[PDB]
Amino acid sequence: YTTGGPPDPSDIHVHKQVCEIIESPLFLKLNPMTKHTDLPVSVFESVIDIINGEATMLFAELTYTLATEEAERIGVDHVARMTATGSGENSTVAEH
Amino acid sequence: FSFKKLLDQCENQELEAPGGIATPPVYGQLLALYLLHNDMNNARYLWKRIPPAIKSANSELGGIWSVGQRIWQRDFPGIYTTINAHQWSETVQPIMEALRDATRRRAFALVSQAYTSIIADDFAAFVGLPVEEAVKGILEQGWQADSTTRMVLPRLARLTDYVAFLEN
């Protein structure tokens, strides 16, 4: 992953170095300057594509999904809610 | 249903109305009402409260107590003969009608649990109708009759209160 707004050459330079670790690495880019309400992470893979007959490393974008891990989810609930105990301790019935 | 209310108004009436000895019809209904509940102890005690004055005055009352002497023995054929013995119109009949049907049910019900096998002639005493009438009825209900020998065979809301209580 990297940080910044639209795709630029300085990302493609660094993605070639990552190709040394695994030959097919994923690229991910987050804009924290986003003026937009939808999720501002966009996912790419790199393709080697020929333009004007010369082979160029160019990115191609991927769509997404949501997936498993109930063990992890129960913590995302607690994390999400951020609620405080009332007069008691909070009830056993309530918590369960 | 109707009878239960009728005991309630009558039960009130015994204490409230008289100088201590109430009139003869009131005592008769009340006695008869105790037999329908099959609360025989209070019935017996009712008759023992009754002076010799009411027993000479009223004979009907003494018939109602006679069915009841037998109910204490629990001898069925005897019950039936006494139901026929006395009638007193209006004042005894609606409750009497109920007494006769309450003992027959008690009798059929009793037999169904009591005996895995019973003689048909003994059964005839219990229901209180003759052999031809009885053997005809048992077949429809789905009880087996054996013939030749003539024997008859009968056939979250709670949980939250509790959790709330233990945690406290």
Swiss-Prot record, chain A:
Recorded superkingdom: Eukaryota
Expression (tissue specificity): Widely expressed.
Coiled-coil region: none
Location in the cell: Nucleus; Cytoplasm; Cytoplasm, Perinuclear region
Signal peptide annotation: none
Assembly and oligomerization: Component of the CSN complex, composed of COPS1/GPS1, COPS2, COPS3, COPS4, COPS5, COPS6, COPS7 (COPS7A or COPS7B), COPS8 and COPS9 isoform 1. In the complex, it probably interacts directly with COPS2, COPS4, COPS5, COPS7 (COPS7A or COPS7B) and COPS9 isoform 1. Interacts with the translation initiation factor EIF3S6. Interacts weakly with RBX1. Directly interacts with COP1 and 14-3-3 protein sigma/SFN. Interacts with ERCC6. (Microbial infection) Interacts with the HIV-1 protein Vpr.
Membership in a protein family: Belongs to the peptidase M67A family. CSN6 subfamily.
Function in brief: Component of the COP9 signalosome complex (CSN), a complex involved in various cellular and developmental processes. The CSN complex is an essential regulator of the ubiquitin (Ubl) conjugation pathway by mediating the deneddylation of the cullin subunits of SCF-type E3 ligase complexes, leading to decrease the Ubl ligase activity of SCF-type complexes such as SCF, CSA or DDB2. The complex is also involved in phosphorylation of p53/TP53, c-jun/JUN, IkappaBalpha/NFKBIA, ITPK1 and IRF8, possibly via its association with CK2 and PKD kinases.
Name the record gives this protein: COP9 signalosome complex subunit 6
Organism per entry: Homo sapiens
This protein's encoding gene: COPS6
Residues of the full protein shown: 125 to 220 of 327
Curated annotation (Swiss-Prot), chain B:
Chief place where the protein resides: cytoplasm
GO biological process: activation of NF-kappaB-inducing kinase activity; COP9 signalosome assembly; negative regulation of cell population proliferation; protein deneddylation; protein neddylation; protein phosphorylation; regulation of protein neddylation
The UniProt record lists the keyword Transmembrane helix: no
Key words of the record: Cytoplasm, Nucleus, Phosphoprotein, Signalosome
InterPro entries, A to Z: COP9_CSN8, CSN8_PSD8_EIF3K, PCI_dom
One GO location term (cellular component): nucleoplasm
Origin: domain of life: Eukaryota
Ranges of residues in domain PCI: 1-155
Ranges in a coiled coil: none
Localization: Cytoplasm; Nucleus
Family: Belongs to the CSN8 family.
Function: Component of the COP9 signalosome complex (CSN), a complex involved in various cellular and developmental processes. The CSN complex is an essential regulator of the ubiquitin (Ubl) conjugation pathway by mediating the deneddylation of the cullin subunits of SCF-type E3 ligase complexes, leading to decrease the Ubl ligase activity of SCF-type complexes such as SCF, CSA or DDB2. The complex is also involved in phosphorylation of p53/TP53, c-jun/JUN, IkappaBalpha/NFKBIA, ITPK1 and IRF8/ICSBP, possibly via its association with CK2 and PKD kinases.
Complex formation: Component of the CSN complex, composed of COPS1/GPS1, COPS2, COPS3, COPS4, COPS5, COPS6, COPS7 (COPS7A or COPS7B), COPS8 and COPS9 isoform 1. In the complex, it probably interacts directly with COPS3, COPS4 and COPS7 (COPS7A or COPS7B).
Protein name: COP9 signalosome complex subunit 8
Gene it is expressed from: COPS8
